[PDB]
Amino acid sequence: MILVMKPYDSLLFREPRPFNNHVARTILPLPQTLAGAVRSAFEILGHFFYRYDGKFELLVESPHDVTQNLGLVKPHRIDKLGITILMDSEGIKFRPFNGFLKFSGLIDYLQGRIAEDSVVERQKIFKKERRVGIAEEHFYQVEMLRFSDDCGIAVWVEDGVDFDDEGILGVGGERRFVKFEKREEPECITNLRSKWKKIRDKINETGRLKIYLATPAILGAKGYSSKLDYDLLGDIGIERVRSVNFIGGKPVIFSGWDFVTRKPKPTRYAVPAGSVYFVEFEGEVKLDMPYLKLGKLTKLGYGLCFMGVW
């Protein structure tokens, strides 16, 4: 089941900093923010963007593996120095490629190949819009997310829940609203599920595994850290792990105002979406699905990760 929400207006997701600070910024939608919308209409698998321009397609955050020239980076290790570096096969230094990757390109991406037409830049999906003088000194400037003409937010939720099909509901920060409809699973997820067996066989035969985080994950057990615990990987069937090479970005620091306790929630650090881990696993993967949940708060749409080969 997919909740397709077209924003009639701009959307706001409050930054952790308070806003007498009139200046205010905006961030990408958070799983805790969108979870409240669906619960106002169970677990949430995650959320992507959707673009309906002639055809309807779903876009996830561009993996940090992909470079500017659409060149994949693989972690290769030198035993002479005994150190592993992420080589792009065209240079030793690289930068992450911002934008979004389609599911139709994602299916091929996990095999180690990507096409130019399978990616979309960030400027073609949504932009940031600044408003000044909103309301002698009461004026505050607020940045919001302005979506494209034929684009919106798709929320991927397991088909075990049901509710009203179509309507209008309020989401985000300030009192805005979007039009939501219930759409069945597109052919992209079906194709991914069909090719999951082949890609899992490739992963098993090659002895290499890649974890791609399509959503932010709070992996911290006692505190909060980007380190990948071996116990979590052992649950899926990994007998042993040799080396772990994680590449991501600045951790997303977020909290919230808990209305139940009338007090703010504890501040939490999460691994940013699009980060990729490379793991040299031993044995085979027993997972029967191409998507798994990691960390805590996985019900709200946190820690959705895909499997890939290299």
Place this chain on the structure above:
RNA sequence: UGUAGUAUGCGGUCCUUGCGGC
């Protein structure tokens, strides 16, 4: 948001036979 005059200063001037011849 509230308050706020595209306004002040500048000459359509200078130059020219209503003549030439019966």
